[PDB]
Amino acid sequence: GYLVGDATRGANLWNTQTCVACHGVDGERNASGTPALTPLNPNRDLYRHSRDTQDRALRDFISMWMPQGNEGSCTGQCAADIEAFIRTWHHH
Ligand code: HEC
Ligand code: NA
């Protein structure tokens, strides 16, 4: 049925699936202290990529659209886990 995302695993996949390169550690900053190349707002109810035709759940946005340039590399449980991780950011 509906996969259950694990935020702790998503914190690791954030790096290994290369999200960190474009979005920094937290959608705001890089480890180096410079601003992220592309911000990521972790608090939208739904996400609509500029090339999409409808709003998506965060995990489905990730499956379809990210990492940009190699979108098929994170789907399914990867996408669920990273969704869960991103939804922890407003507790930062
Ligand atoms: C640079 C090569 C990127 C990599 C690697 C990843 N993302 Fe990305 N992301 C990138 C761009 C240019 C954009 C904008 C897309 C558009 O609408 O044209 C995004 C957007 C996101 C968002 C939405 C952010 C928002 O504030 O609405 C999310 C949630 C997102 N990206 C997630 C994400 C994840 C989980 C990645 C690793 C699997 C990832 N991105 C990689 C550029 C790049
Ligand atoms: Na994907």
Side-chain angles (χ1 to χ4, degrees):
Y2 178 77
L3 301 180
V4 178
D6 185 294
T8 302
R9 295 195 308 222
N12 175 59
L13 290 162
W14 177 260
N15 299 131
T16 66
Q17 305 316 287
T18 79
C19 321
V20 59
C22 295
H23 296 298
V25 304
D26 63 357
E28 180 187 42
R29 72 193 71 200
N30 297 306
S32 70
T34 61
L37 180 58
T38 301
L40 194 173
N41 182 328
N43 303 317
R44 309 192 195 283
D45 58 349
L46 296 167
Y47 290 81
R48 187 175 171 154
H49 191 281
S50 65
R51 296 178 46 206
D52 208 341
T53 57
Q54 72 171 80
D55 293 341
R56 306 288 178 185
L58 175 53
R59 58 174 64 179
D60 295 329
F61 175 103
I62 295 167
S63 289
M64 289 178 70
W65 299 108
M66 296 291 141
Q68 188 151 299
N70 191 22
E71 294 80 4
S73 64
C74 183
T75 65
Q77 194 68 58
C78 174
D81 289 348
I82 297 178
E83 171 185 67
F85 173 57
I86 292 169
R87 295 307 195 179
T88 70
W89 291 4
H90 70 302
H91 292 186
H92 285 355

